[PDB]
Structures are given as C-alpha cells and as structure tokens.
Amino acid sequence: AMRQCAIYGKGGIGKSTTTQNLVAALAEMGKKVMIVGCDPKADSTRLILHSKAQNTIMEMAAEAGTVEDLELEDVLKAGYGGVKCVESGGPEPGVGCAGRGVITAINFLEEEGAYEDDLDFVFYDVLGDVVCGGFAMPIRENKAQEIYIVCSGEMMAMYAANNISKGIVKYANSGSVRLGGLICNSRNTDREDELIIALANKLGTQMIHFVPRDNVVQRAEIRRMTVIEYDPKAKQADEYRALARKVVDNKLLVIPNPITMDELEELLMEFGIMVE
Amino acid sequence: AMRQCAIYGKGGIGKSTTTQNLVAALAEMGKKVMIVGCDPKADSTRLILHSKAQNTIMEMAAEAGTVEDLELEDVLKAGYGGVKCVESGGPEPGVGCAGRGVITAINFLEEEGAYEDDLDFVFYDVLGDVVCGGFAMPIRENKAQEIYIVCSGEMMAMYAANNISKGIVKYANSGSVRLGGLICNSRNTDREDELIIALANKLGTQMIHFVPRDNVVQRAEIRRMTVIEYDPKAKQADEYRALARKVVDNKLLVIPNPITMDELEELLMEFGIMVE
Ligand SMILES: Nc1ncnc2c1ncn2[C@@H]1O[C@H](COP(=O)(O)OP(=O)(O)O)[C@@H](O)[C@H]1O
Ligand SMILES: Nc1ncnc2c1ncn2[C@@H]1O[C@H](COP(=O)(O)OP(=O)(O)O)[C@@H](O)[C@H]1O
Ligand SMILES: [Mg+2]
Numbered sequence: 314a315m316r317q318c319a320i321y322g323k324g325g326i327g328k329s330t331t332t333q334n335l336v337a338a339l340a341e342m343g344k345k346v347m348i349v350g351c352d353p354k355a356d357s358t359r360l361i362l363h364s365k366a367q368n369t370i371m372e373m374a375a376e377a378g379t380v381e382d383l384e385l386e387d388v389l390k391a392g393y394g395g396v397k398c399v400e401s402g403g404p405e406p407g408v409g410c411a412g413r414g415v416i417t418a419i420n421f422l423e424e425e426g427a428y429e430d431d432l433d434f435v436f437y438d439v440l441g442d443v444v445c446g447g448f449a450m451p452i453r454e455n456k457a458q459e460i461y462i463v464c465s466g467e468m469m470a471m472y473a474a475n476n477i478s479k480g481i482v483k484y485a486n487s488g489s490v491r492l493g494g495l496i497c498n499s500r501n502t503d504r505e506d507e508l509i510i511a512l513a514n515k516l517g518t519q520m521i522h523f524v525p526r527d528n529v530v531q532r533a534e535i536r537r538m539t540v541i542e543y544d545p546k547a548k549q550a551d552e553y554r555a556l557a558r559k560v561v562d563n564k565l566l567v568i569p570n571p572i573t574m575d576e577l578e579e580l581l582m583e584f585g586i587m588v589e
Numbered sequence: 590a591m592r593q594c595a596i597y598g599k600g601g602i603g604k605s606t607t608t609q610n611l612v613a614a615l616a617e618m619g620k621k622v623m624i625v626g627c628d629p630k631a632d633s634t635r636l637i638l639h640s641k642a643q644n645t646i647m648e649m650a651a652e653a654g655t656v657e658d659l660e661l662e663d664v665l666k667a668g669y670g671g672v673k674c675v676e677s678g679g680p681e682p683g684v685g686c687a688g689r690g691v692i693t694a695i696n697f698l699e700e701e702g703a704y705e706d707d708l709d710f711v712f713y714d715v716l717g718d719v720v721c722g723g724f725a726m727p728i729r730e731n732k733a734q735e736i737y738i739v740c741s742g743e744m745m746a747m748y749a750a751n752n753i754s755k756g757i758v759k760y761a762n763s764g765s766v767r768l769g770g771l772i773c774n775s776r777n778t779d780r781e782d783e784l785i786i787a788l789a790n791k792l793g794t795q796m797i798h799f800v801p802r803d804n805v806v807q808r809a810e811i812r813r814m815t816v817i818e819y820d821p822k823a824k825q826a827d828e829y830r831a832l833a834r835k836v837v838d839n840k841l842l843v844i845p846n847p848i849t850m851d852e853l854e855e856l857l858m859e860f861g862i863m864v865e
C-alpha cells in the first residue's frame with residue numbers, strides 16, 4: 314500500500330516549505346516518499362534536491378520530442394533521505410491552461426511505473442487559488458485520497474480552504490478523495506490556532522498541526538535545504554516531525570462541509586483577528 | 590475617451606481594497622468610474638455598494654435564462670460617488686474553467702453599451718495567480734490598456750508580478766496592453782519600498798505608490814466602506830488620494846522586461862527582506 318496525499322492552499326501560504334519539510338521528516342523516520350510538484354512555480358522539490366529548482370516534465374518532453382521519449386529514470390531525481398522528486402511544469406503565462414502540465418505529468422508517472430510498491434507516501438504539491446484544469450485533476454481523477462490544506466488566519470487563506478473543500482464535495486460520488494486536515498502555517502497572530510481549529514470543526518475535519526513562523530525556515534532555504542536537514546536540532550525541525558507523526562497516524566478523512574462567507578466572516582470576528 | 594485599467598496581483602495581496610479605495614478617490618475628484626470584478630471571490634464591489642457582495646452576471650444570467658435576457662440597467666449597480674459596479678462570477682470549484690465568467694461578463698458589458706462616453710475610467714479587478722482563460726482575456730483581447738500590479742516584498746507577490754508581466758509581453762504584438770506600474774501594498778517590512786522600486790526598475794516600469802498597512806482599512810471594511818467614505822480625514826485616505834492622483838497623471842505605459850528567478854532572489858537578498 315501507499316498513501317497518496319495532496320497539499321493544497323493559496324499561493325505563498327507555505328505549501329512547498331511545509332511539504333518538503335514534512336517529507337524530510339518522513340524520510341528521517343524511514344519512509345519512502347515521492348514528491349510531485351503540481352504548481353507552475355516549479356520550485357516544490359528544490360529543498361530536497363539542494364537545487365535552484367528542477368527541470369520540469371513539460372520542459373524535458375519538449376527537448377526529447379514527446380513525453381514518450383522520456384525515461385522515468387531520467388526524470389525522477391532523488392535528494393535528501395532518498396526522497397524522489399519530479400516537477401510537472403506548465404505553459405508560460407498567457408499561453409494555454411496553467412494546469413495542463415499536471416495532467417501530462419501524473420499520467421506519465423502512472424504509465425511509467427513510478428508508483429512502485431515500496432513507496433509509503435506520495436505528496437502532490439498543488440496550486441489552490443483556482444480549482445480547475447490540471448489543478449483539479451488530483452481530486453477529479455482520484456489521484457490524491459488525502460487532501461491537507463495549508464492555511465492561516467488570513468481570510469484569503471481560509472477562503473481558499475473552503476473553495477478546495479467545495480471541489481472535494483463536488484467529486485465525492487466516485488473515487489475516494491477526502492479532506493484529511495488543515496495545517497495552520499502561522500502568521501504570528503493572536504488566537505490563530507483557535508481560529509483554524511474552529512474552521513476545521515465547521516468543515517468537519519481537524520487542524521492536524523499548527524506550524525509556527527520561524528526564521529530558521531528562511532536560513533535553511535537560502536542554503537537550499539529543509540530545516541530537517543539544515544538543523545536537525547531546531548525547534549522548528551521538531552514541529553515538522555510532530556506534523557509528520559500526526560499525518561502518519563491520521564485516520565480522519567472526511568467529505569467536508571463547506572461554509573458560507575457569512576460563517577467565515579463570523580469566525581474572523583469571533584477570534585478578534587481583524588488584533589493590532 | 591476613457592482609460593481602461595486592470596488591477597492584477599496574487600490572491601489576498603490587496604487588489605480589491607486598493608481598487609475600491611483608488612476608485613472612491615477618483616469619484617471624490619469628480620471622475621466617473623466603473624469597476625468590473627474579474628475574480629471568482631466576487632467581493633470586488635462590496636465597499637462601493639455597502640453590501641455583502643454583488644450578485645454576479647453568471648448568477649443573474651442563470652436565473653433569467655440566458656445572458657441575453659439580462660438588461661444592463663438590471664445588472665450595473667451604483668454606489669459611493671456614483672461608481673458603477675458589476676461582478677463577473679464564475680463556475681463553482683471543480684466545475685469548468687474558473688475564469689469563464691470574465692469572458693461572458695466583459696462581452697455582455699461591451700454589447701449592451703456599458704462603455705458610455707461619459708466614463709473616465711474602467712477598472713477590472715482580476716485574479717492574477719494564473720494567467721490563462723478568462724483571467725488572461727483582459728490582456729489577450731486588449732480590454733485593459735493599463736495594467737497596475739499590486740504586490741509586496743513577499744517573494745510570491747513579486748513572482749506573480751513577473752508572471753503577469755510575461756503575459757503582457759506575450760500579447761504585445763497586437764493591441765496596446767501595457768504595464769502601468771507596481772503598487773506596493775505594504776507588509777510593514779524594512780526597505781520594502783526600495784525593494785519594489787528596484788523590481789519596477791528591472792521590469793522597466795515604476796512603483797506608482799507605496800500603500801501603508803493601516804488597520805483603518807479593517808475598520809472601514811467591517812462597515813462595508815472604503816476608507817475614503819468611512820473616514821475622509823484618515824491618513825490612509827490621503828494615501829489612496831495620492832495613488833489616484835498619480836494614476837491620473839501617469840504617462841509611463843511600457844512593454845515590461847520580465848526577470849529571472851535568479852534576479853528575483855537577488856533582489857530579496859539585497860534588501861535584507863529574508864529582517865527579523
Ligand atoms: N513556518 C514558516 N516560517 C517561516 N517562513 C515560512 C514558513 N512557511 C513558509 N515560509 C516562507 O514563506 C514563503 C512561501 O512559502 P512556500 O512554501 O514557497 O509557499 P507556496 O508553496 O504555498 O507558494 C517562503 O519564503 C518560505 O520560506
Ligand atoms: N493597506 C492595507 N492595510 C490594511 N489592510 C489591508 C490593506 N490592503 C488590504 N488589506 C486587507 O487585506 C485583505 C485582502 O485584501 P483584498 O483587497 O481583499 O485582496 P485581493 O482582492 O487581492 O484578494 C483584506 O482583509 C483587507 O482588509
Ligand atoms: Mg510552492
């Protein structure tokens with residue numbers, strides 16, 4: 314068995330930092346993991362690979378001729394802890410559908426046998442500001458059974474979590490895509506943990522971990538590493554280890570209950586976020 | 590003549606707050622303005638209308654039968670300062686292309702004569718996290734000649750500005766869509782103004798205004814108003830008046846020079862943003 318997990322959330326919320334650090338912690342534990350980057354920014358694997366980024370399947374297929382001319386062994390790259398990494402890529406801005414590369418990439422990985430029995434986890438790192446095209450494909454086509462949404466007390470981030478939840482509900486009649494939890498990536502605001510707990514309860518899920526804001530992240534990323542590798546003794550490293558443990562142990566996978574904008578605004582008002 | 594302007598930027602960066610306040614300031618000056626919401630969040634006009642939000646063209650067309658059964662006089666709503674407001678709407682998450690409603694809305698407004706000679710400005714408030722489908726249509730189809738990108742010292746916000754700039758370049762062979770400036774919506778970080786000035790210079794544009802972070806925004810929005818209407822004497826009101834004046838006076842409209850990720854990272858390093 315392997316658990317197929319997707320990390321969604323609005324742009325800049327911390328998807329790639331959280332995913333790569335969570336996955337590093339999983340590898341530290343002895344799990345075999347593959348990360349599939351599904352965001353056109355295409356830097357979802359650089360902290361595992363110690364790299365600027367990673368050349369994308371779309372780029373490599375164009376240089377090879379067709380995606381069929383690509384070999385999996387040429388595409389997947391292994392970094393920290395043996396974690397395997399691939400990037401989908403996507404068309405340039407203003408050219409065709411921004412998510413088109415996700416479809417190409419996931420189909421290529423499936424056809425070429427990338428989902429080997431020995432894997433314990435696959436994590437897709439997916440752009441979540443729109444839920445359509447290739448960005449909806451992991452949900453629509455039943456590729457990621459466990460969705461974890463990174464958010465924060467920011468209204469836009471909670472709105473994005475609600476939108477992603479609506480996409481999960483839309484496809485609940487087939488497949489088995491479920492909401493696994495919210496991950497609060499802290500903005501250092503008061504009662505933010507309570508706010509995301511309350512949001513999760515309304516959606517029917519849980520807040521699986523509160524990730525503190527910690528500058529060690531920036532120092533590790535300047536050096537192209539996860540915090541796990543950069544400073545295994547850092548407090549923030551233990552935070553990512555706690556998140557990884559709870560993901561491993563998680564058994565709550567639900568069809569969520571999306572909320573109204575009135576309910577979102579009520580949450581914000583309640584927890585005094587809108588704080589000096 | 591009327592100037593057609595579009596405000597782009599990543600989600601949550603301040604597009605709708607900046608646009609509605611800038612437009613309120615323009616109306617305060619005696620300009621006639623229409624705001625066209627091109628973001629599925631569909632709350633781009635609520636501060637002008639004193640409202641929860643506004644029912645969208647997609648919603649209204651569905652209740653009427655077809656978009657042809659809609660009357661412009663039933664769709665456009667006027668609020669503060671006589672500013673006219675409309676929302677595109679869009680499909681629900683996981684259903685079809687998130688930008689499809691923008692195309693329907695802009696074509697409807699054009700066909701039904703919404704662009705009356707008496708208008709001085711039209712502002713489109715456009716989702717900018719992907720540059721495709723209906724979200725690219727104001728650039729691709731030459732609807733907004735002046736693009737202003739709201740950003741901040743956040744790497745994701747500068748990345749979005751660069752992506753939008755690439756879309757402008759892609760369509761520069763026809764039409765007249767140009768980059769008019771960057772608007773820095775402050776995150777209260779050190780040297781942020783200098784950083785966005787430097788980014789603008791690299792792109793070939795300017796930073797037309799630095800908008801401070803000010804809690805008066807939240808207090809005005811709780812009451813469904815712009816700061817301009819809520820507290821005309823607020824310092825932040827004068828900030829939006831300064832932004833509006835500079836937009837009125839702006840004559841620099843360029844085909845931008847998108848930069849590499851290396852250059853973006855260099856900017857971040859230079860201005861010590863990555864600050865305690
Ligand atoms: N917990 C954290 N503490 C400090 N900085 C963080 C944290 N999480 C994310 N960041 C920073 O926020 C920025 C965006 O995070 P990233 O994971 O790239 O977002 P996304 O992938 O959702 O667009 C990065 O500069 C990263 O260093
Ligand atoms: N200059 C500012 N000072 C204080 N709060 C701001 C400022 N600009 C935006 N905000 C707040 O940031 C949030 C997002 O702004 P909004 O304009 O809705 O973003 P977008 O339309 O780009 O998604 C809102 O809660 C708004 O009150
Ligand atoms: Mg990312």
Ligand SMILES: [Mg+2]
Binds near residue numbers: 714
């Ligand atoms: Mg908005």
